Copies of this chain bind each other. A is one copy, B any other.
């Protein structure tokens, strides 16, 4: 099929995994948020959360 990002997402839907993958992303974000508010986040988790925020939203 087409060589683009849409093709992957249509394959993923045919695989029945779209809700699943978004749930995993949502679980990771929740975990990062809790660790940051708790003060237990590692350096790599602070970095990961910063990068995710900046990819989703302006600043």
Q: How many residues of A contact B (CB 8 A)?
A: 32
Contact status B29-A56, CB under 8 Å: yes
Contact status A43-B13, CB under 8 Å: no
Q: Chain A at the B interface: mostly helix, strand, loop or mixed?
A: helix
A10 to chain B, nearest CB (A): 9
How far does the alpha carbon of A4 sit from the alpha carbon of B22 in the complex, in Å?
A: 28
Contact status A48-B41, CB under 8 Å: no
Q: Which residue of B lies closest to A21 (CB)?
A: B53
A51 to chain B, nearest CB (A): 6
A46 to chain B, nearest CB (A): 4
Task: List 14 A-B pairs, Cβ < 8 Å.
Answer: A4-B46, A5-B50, A6-B41, A9-B36, A9-B41, A13-B36, A18-B33, A18-B37, A24-B56, A24-B57, A25-B53, A28-B56, A51-B59, A55-B55
